Paper text:
The bifunctional enzyme Δ1-pyrroline-5-carboxylate synthase (P5CS) is vital to the synthesis of proline and ornithine, playing an essential role in human health and agriculture. The P5CS molecule contains two domains, GK and GPR, catalyzing the first and second steps in the biosynthesis of proline from glutamate. The GK domain catalyzes glutamate phosphorylation, and the GPR domain catalyzes the NADPH-dependent reduction of γ-glutamyl phosphate (G5P) to glutamate-γ-semialdehyde (GSA). Our results describe the assembly mechanism of P5CS filaments, in which the GK domain forms tetramer and the GPR domain forms dimer structure, and both domains form specific interaction interfaces.
Filaments in three conditions with (1) glutamate (P5CSGlu), (2) glutamate and ATPγS (P5CSGlu/ATPγS), and (3) glutamate, ATP, and NADPH (P5CSMix) were imaged in cryo-EM for single-particle analysis (SPA). Long and flexible filaments of P5CS were observed under all the three conditions. After 3D classification and 3D reconstruction, the electron density maps of the P5CSGlu, P5CSGlu/ATPγS, and P5CSMix filaments reached resolutions of 4.0 Å, 4.2 Å, and 3.6 Å, respectively. The addition of glutamate to the P5CS samples induces micron-scale filaments. Consistent with our previous study, glutamate (a substrate of P5CS) promotes the formation and maintenance of Drosophila P5CS filaments. P5CS filament structures in all the three states showed characteristics of double helix. In P5CSGlu, P5CSGlu/ATPγS, and P5CSMix filaments, neighboring GPR dimers interact with each other and form a helical structure. The interaction formed between F642-P644 of the contact loops in adjacent GPR domains, which appears as a CH/Pi interaction, is critical for the filamentation. In the P5CSGlu filament, no ligand binds to the GPR domain. In the P5CSGlu filament, the GK and GPR domains are likely in a stable conformational state, while vibration may occur in the GPR domain of P5CSGlu/ATPγS and P5CSMix filaments due to the binding of ligands. Although we solved the clear structure of the P5CSGlu filament, further research is needed to understand how the conformation of glutamate binding contributes to the extension of P5CS filaments.
Residue numbers in the entry:
A (entry chain D), B (entry chain B): 45 to 124, 142 to 211, 232 to 275, 297 to 776
C (entry chain A): 174 to 211, 232 to 259
The structure:
């Protein structure tokens, strides 16, 4: 044929369906499963109304007639198949007529048989009939002339052949083709492809694109016409090596992790040193590459956030180099470090140590600056790593990828890094399993939000909402809080760690500090809303806040006041995402009160929300901000990528040996841990 | 009426549907959305074929006729509604006839109007018509006499009224009723209930059970007839307080966690002491309670695993008491403990400490022995806790629950514990969110497996498979490995930490140790299979293993031999669940080789797999065995239930203060952590 | 169609279909497979032939033969 990838499938003008004998009959062959059939006819009427050309081949009429009689077969099986199929042919035709006409489309029964394709005069005749039909916006239903019949799939195939149709859809019961029988390890559902199988080869040999989907899957056509990876697609085009489809990537990375596992002593250290050197040495190439790709982005003019962050300057590269050198020098004893040293009994020395995670997969928008940072994180953390940016930066990404592939090639030399470009269909990517461990989204709310909504059955580091909170107490210095909140909002107001809210003691409404901070926000041009209690408070004041759990990002900050400490606490727990908060006051009693009561990921006392940077904590280079309730809170450095592993070196010990029989007792003496 | 709970809904003999005008028309009101309609008719034909009595009330015929004309409306809107509905009434009737008759059921159009219910002679007439119909196994379709018409829901309601029908289904577009408008925090979808709302009250006032589902939801009837919590159910029966539906439980528990948060010093310690005392003091009551419930289980005769584990003896209670006293004495400094102490600059003292998780939810089969254990875990870990056992032990569970409620009532006194009995529909339970953190399944493979398959978007501690592995090296003492594997399999062969496999160096096939261990397994009566390589090896030997990733539980152990260390490693990684493994040898070079290369949750060297007990590790009382790749590996003590929380006590510090303007620099001096 | 009477396997097939039908009190309507067609009376005649039917009625417009 001509079509090669599912991408090309929005561009086929002539289609042929062939429903399978199992998708329409109910689970008796003694009636009709209807819902599926209805879905099918609706999809088909749609693709036709679009303007594509379709010729259904409905198999399995026998069930219709078998049900329709249901009485004479009864009275004959006590006094005594094809005929039932003939009568069912009639009835089924009518039914299709009713349903299709309910979309206004008209249809016309057509009967054929395999011999009718073999003689050539009948080939002429039938093709003339079909052309005359299709020319008239009619969707002929093509059954076999059962009458002349001793599963009608070869029929559809060679039909498309004579028609030389764009794509043959072949619905069925099975989802697709596997590598091997399903009762077998390695039943790799072979989506593309280099009985039904034969006939598919055949039709391909006739220059025809074939696809085999699953009937029970909804919107299967509308699905498959989009290019979505479903069913089984067939073409030997075999254009490029395209080294990994998606997964041999993953296994490789696993292998590379196993590799670098045995290269701790200055090995990964010298390696990331090498990476920093390659960064500071060959920047001309990558600089021009980004300049080029940025020019390419300019004509697109996507988003000033994007159109600003995809930028890069040799100053940024110097920043990255010093960060990487830092990571190097301080990433000395992160892996393999033991955490416990204990003896249960003589020659029973348990110890628990540090080990990598496995197959990390980053996701982020066009920001090539992060790429080498997270790569250094991976390599210093000795675990594998995948990547997926966005659309832009792609060439820059490749340049950085080559640089880092060199950097790792020096020692260990194994490419436990990859890149999944060419629109890998993120949802399908996360649909994988058994390989990837930590989705590390990095772009912004949207990105991470779309992820959390799409991600299922896979750990997803990171947060999605930046609703912080700032409480002010009655015994807090006024100008102190003034400058504090001033900065808290007006340092990078589009940050995640931002105070999209500000809560104040009820008492301090008297000192007009509320007015003072309104003045300040005005000074900074901050569109402020008001809290319901605040709404009650003044005459008309600032407008009412839309919703307390809303997000601004821009120069906006809801403000509300409550009576007591505890009331504030409750409001926080009610609305706060447990992300970040701070208190300002001079009482340490209340201070501790807050400290404990709070349950945010991180809480402060007279500091700024903009402190949540990890690097600011001397926590090395951060990787993300996690709000999940496990293993990680907010600023996650490298140790958020290290799990443990119990090891145990006995000599001759056994389980029942520590029972009453063997003189084996318990010590649990906490040895001095290394 | 008479019916009270969705449980009662398998027992209504007369039903009435009323499709909504939005579930059938497509998103134009200019055609017909069919698939939904087909689903509806199929469900209805099903419930009727069951023997229940149904009378559809299909709204929205206008769309049918509007589509059917589509030409004269066209030519008239250039030269110039009810009539279209009349013609559509005809056509729609036919269509229903075709479809229903395809299940063999027959139908008969019936037209009414609201005034037809008001006069009484017509009430007699119409009721006679309906009774005569239903007596004849016909499903009358009840439309309104549009002809006499200036959304036909009151009609269906008062229809059911005159009929005095069991349950009125009222499909629609909306999923159900909320607490408040959806654009509002707290849109609590009020499943039960103490426009459509009015009419529902009305019909209830007529002694009629009403339900309002969502049309687009599949199997909605078959769903709702089962008793499944869907749509909106209506009854003011209000039998019992049933203190929590499901959730005020959860919030309470959150509150109780916040409570016990401020009770570290010997408070929870003395409290769990009190619990142990109550355990050792009032055991008569709970002992007889279990005796009773065990007798109740005996007549059921469910499962010797269950029928054995639900047992309890005062010796078991002594075991629990000593375990609880241990937990008490050693659970001193688990919470609030700081992990880092660092100064970034003058009066910038970050420190990271220990904090609870939140709302833990246990799940396990009838094993009341664990209940107080995990309760002690919760209370010593200062976090809330829910519970859900199975069917049996329920009364025993209540007894233990009262004991522990007392125990916590002493100090802190807040009941941050609950129990979700009366078939809370586990899948619905885990469908919750924003409350529960750690599903801690405890029963067995099934339990945890069903969980992992059902659980979505919720952390699930624990494993599901116990495929361990035992490698034997060429330089390993024979009798050593003999006794080792002997115990490894024959100590509690139904355990999770079991060696459902045994791998041997290729060389040692020569020393016939393979034969020796076959002899030993025979001694112990172990049905052994063989590996494909082993299959090749001998004449016929033991039978071929079915599948390498299978599980036995009983006295079975696949055995296979491979050439080299590394080959074994690869086979492990290929099939091993990374759960547990051990090596036996005398070379430490290979020893370390294995140690590193391996990636199991836990690996040993000359010890027994039966060592994976946590308690055996002096790890306090275990709570579970986690195989997830995050936060927890295998034996998880209490610290697997403690997260951290960054805190920070600055004086006057701000973000831009550490910029070039303010004399604020970086120290990151690792203070001696407490 | 007329060719369907000529091959014998199809003769068997179609006759089986007809016998199975008539045995079930069904009145099959016998049109020609226009689809496979470039006044269908020979068809009815030879149909009755294969069936060996008692009487062939052949309605028409003309009253009879002169
Ligand atoms: N060749 C056709 C049947 C030919 C016929 O006898 O009509 C098949 O294998 O299905
Ligand atoms: N009262 C009915 C209509 C009465 C009639 O005119 O038939 C209604 O409001 O819908
Ligand atoms: N179709 C023609 C006969 C075709 C032929 O075999 O010559 C008929 O029905 O009378």
């Amino acid at each position: 044929p001509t079509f090669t990838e599912r991408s090309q499938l929005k561009y086929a003008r002539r289609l042929v369906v062939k429903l399978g004998s199992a998708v329409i009959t109910r689970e008796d062959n003694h009636g009709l499963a209807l819902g599926r059939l209805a879905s099918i006819v609706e999809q088909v009427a749609e693709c036709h109304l679009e303007g594509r050309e379709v010729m259904m081949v409905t198999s399995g009429a026998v069930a219709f007639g078998k049900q329709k009689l249901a009485q004479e077969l009864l009275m004959s099986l006590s006094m005594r198949p094809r005929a039932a199929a003939a009568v069912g042919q009639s009835g089924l035709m009518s039914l299709y007529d009713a349903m299709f006409a309910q979309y206004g489309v008209k249809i016309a029964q057509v009967l054929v048989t395999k011999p009718d394709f073999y003689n050539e005069e009948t080939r002429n005749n039938l093709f003339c009939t079909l052309s005359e039909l299709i020319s008239l916006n009619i969707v002929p239903i093509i059954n076999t002339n059962d009458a002349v019949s001793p599963d009608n799939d070869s029929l559809s195939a060679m039909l498309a052949a004579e028609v030389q149709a764009d794509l043959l859809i072949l619905m069925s019961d099975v989802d697709g083709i596997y590598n091997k029988p399903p009762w077998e390890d390695g039943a790799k559902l072979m989506h593309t492809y280099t009985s039904k199988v034969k006939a598919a080869t055949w039709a391909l040999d006739r220059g025809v694109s074939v696809v085999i989907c699953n009937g029970m899957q909804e919107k299967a056509i509308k699905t498959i016409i989009g290019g979505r990876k479903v069913g089984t697609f067939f073409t030997e085009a075999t254009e490029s090596a395209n080294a990994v489809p998606v997964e041999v990537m993953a296994e490789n990375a696993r292998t590379g992790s196993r590799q670098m596992q045995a290269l701790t002593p200055a090995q990964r250290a010298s390696a990331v040193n090498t990476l920093a050197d390659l960064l500071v040495s060959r920047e001309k190439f990558i600089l021009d590459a980004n300049a080029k790709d940025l020019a390419e982005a300019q004509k697109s003019g996507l988003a000033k956030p994007l159109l600003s962050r995809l930028s890069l300057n040799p100053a940024k590269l110097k920043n990255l180099s010093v960060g990487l050198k830092q990571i190097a020098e301080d990433s000395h004893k992160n892996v393999g470090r033991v955490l416990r040293r204990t003896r249960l009994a003589d020659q029973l020395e348990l110890k628990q140590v540090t080990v990598p995670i496995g197959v990390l997969l980053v996701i982020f928008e066009s920001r090539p600056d992060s790429l080498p940072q997270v790569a250094a994180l991976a390599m210093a953390s000795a675990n594998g790593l995948l990547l997926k940016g966005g659309k832009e930066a792609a060439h820059s990404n490749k340049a950085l990828m080559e640089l880092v592939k060199e950097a790792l090639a020096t020692v260990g030399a194994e490419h436990a890094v990859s890149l999944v470009s060419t629109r890998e269909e993120i949802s399908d990517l996360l649909s994988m399993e058994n390989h990837i461990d930590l989705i590390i989204p990095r772009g912004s709310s949207d990105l991470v939000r779309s992820i959390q909504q799409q991600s299922l059955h896979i750990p997803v580091l990171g947060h999605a909402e930046g609703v912080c909170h700032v409480y002010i107490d009655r015994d807090a210095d006024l100008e102190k809080a003034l400058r504090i909140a001033r900065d808290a909002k007006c340092d990078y107001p589009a940050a995640c760690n931002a105070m999209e809210t500000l809560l104040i003691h009820e008492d301090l409404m008297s000192g007009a500090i509320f007015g003072d901070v309104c003045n300040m926000l005005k000074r900074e041009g901050v569109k402020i809303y008001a809290g319901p209690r605040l709404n009650q408070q003044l005459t008309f004041g600032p407008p009412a806040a839309k919703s307390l759990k809303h997000e601004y990002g821009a120069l906006e900050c809801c403000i509300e006041v409550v009576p007591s400490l505890d009331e504030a606490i409750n409001h926080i727990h009610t609305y706060g995402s447990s992300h970040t908060d701070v208190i300002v006051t001079e009482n340490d009693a209340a201070a501790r009160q807050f400290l404990g009561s709070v349950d945010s990921a991180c809480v402060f006392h007279n500091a700024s929300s903009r402190f949540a940077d990890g690097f600011r904590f001397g926590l090395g280079a951060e990787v993300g901000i996690s709000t999940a309730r496990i293993h990680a809170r907010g600023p996650v450095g490298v140790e958020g990528l290290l799990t443990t592993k119990w090891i145990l070196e006995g000599q001759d010990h056994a389980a029942a040996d520590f029972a009453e029989g063997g003189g084996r007792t318990w010590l649990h003496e906490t040895l001095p841990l290394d």
